Every structure is written in C-alpha cells, then in structure tokens.
From Swiss-Prot:
Orphan receptor that acts as a transcription activator in the absence of bound ligand. Binds specifically to an estrogen response element and activates reporter genes controlled by estrogen response elements. Induces the expression of PERM1 in the skeletal muscle. Belongs to the nuclear hormone receptor family. NR3 subfamily. No physiological activating ligand is known for this orphan receptor, but 4-hydroxytamoxifen and diethylstilbestrol act as inverse agonists and deactivate ESRRG. Acetylated by PCAF/KAT2 (in vitro). It comes from the Eukaryota. This is Estrogen-related receptor gamma. It comes from Homo sapiens (Human). Homodimer. Binds TLE1, PNRC1 and PNRC2. Binds GRIP1. Interacts with NRIP1, NCOA1 and NCOR2. The chain holds residues 235 to 456 of 458 of the full protein.
Amino acid sequence: NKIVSHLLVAEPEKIYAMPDPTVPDSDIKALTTLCDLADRELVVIIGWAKHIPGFSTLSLADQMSLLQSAWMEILILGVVYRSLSFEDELVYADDYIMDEDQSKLAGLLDLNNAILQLVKKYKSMKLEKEEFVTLKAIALANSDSMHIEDVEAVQKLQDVLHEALQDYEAGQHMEDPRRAGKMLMTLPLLRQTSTKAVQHFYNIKLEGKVPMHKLFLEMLEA
Ligand SMILES: CC(C)(c1ccc(O)cc1)c1ccc(O)cc1
Ligand code: NA
C-alpha cells in the first residue's frame, strides 16, 4: 500500500529527552523532563501531519481541532511502539526509559501501567512499524473533535486511512482476514488512556509546580 509506505518515509527522527544532569532526581524533574520532551515532539507531530494525504487541504481550524483532540494518543502510541522490545519498561526516549520504580516517584504508576497494558496487547499482536504509523494517522483523523467544521472532509480522511490499513492487511496478512479490525479494536484503550493522561497533566498544570512550554500548554488547555 502506497499510503503506508508514504507514512513510513514521513516518520520523524528520534528525539532525546535530555534530563538535566545537574538536577536532583525528583517527581518534578521527571514530570518536567517528560513534558519538555512532549513539547518538542508536538512540534514534529505537526510537521508530520502535513504529509498525511488530504490533511493539509482541510481548513487550518479543522487541522488544529484534529490535533488538539488527538495529540495525546499520538504521543502515547509513540512511547508504546518504542517500548515493544522491552519488558515492563517505557521508552520515552533512548535516554529516558522508565521502570516501575520511576513511574512510582513520578506519580505515574497507574498511567504508565495502562500504557504498559497497551504495549502488552501490541506485543501479542506483533504490531509492525507499518501498522503503527497507520494507526497514528487513523488516531489523528478519528479523534472525535467536538468542533469540526467540515464533517464530510474529516470522514473522507478517516476513510482513506482505514482503506490503507485494510489494503495493507489484506495483502500482508492473508493468514488472518480480520487483522485490520483487530488493529482498529485497539484504539479504544488508546483513547481511554489518553483521556486520563490529559486529565492528569491538566491537574499537574493547575498545581503549578511543573513548568510547561507554550505548545504543550496550548494542547493541554484545548
Ligand atoms: C504526555 C506525556 C508527558 C508524554 C511525553 C512524551 C511521549 O513520547 C509520550 C507522552 C506522558 C503522558 C502519560 C504518562 O503516563 C507519561 C508521560
Ligand atoms: Na482517535
């Protein structure tokens, strides 16, 4: 499938978390580091989305609405995929892999465990990079924003991305005629974990103890 191959080459380069070596470890350092990483990823995600067929033709508003509703799912799918060959560890970046203890002192035990639940299921399904990038695009198009202007156009985008997944699976996984649907059935857990993550960091935002940059702040306040 061409769309899949296109998404593959449009995949952005890895990013480093770069936790400050002079700062003492604490929940504030972890959260600050993670949100800092996320801010930089959002910049790249925005650029990445321009490569998705038909995305740049939507109105700026609709493009923004889709992103404001899907940003967390995209960010989470990323750490999920990066962590597939690991055990009980989340690879936020090559230089930032969180084990159970780290999640604990960062107050992210329940959230990271949900992310690990996502990882568990994808490991069992043997999620391929081709499927990961297509799911990321589908997640963006199917984000369910409450403010979409051109419903049909967004539906059209969802349809083209779904067709790519179906096409890919029909030609690459003939042994399982229902693999495309299984992939789609993983989206609910992604959506569920993201809704909680957004609520969690929104609260962290209110507490005011963790500095956050412009873009991250913009998505979170959406
Ligand atoms: C949004 C968040 C700061 C993040 C940062 C970077 C990333 O690649 C993916 C997600 C995050 C959400 C939930 C979570 O449990 C840990 C980190
Ligand atoms: Na979605």
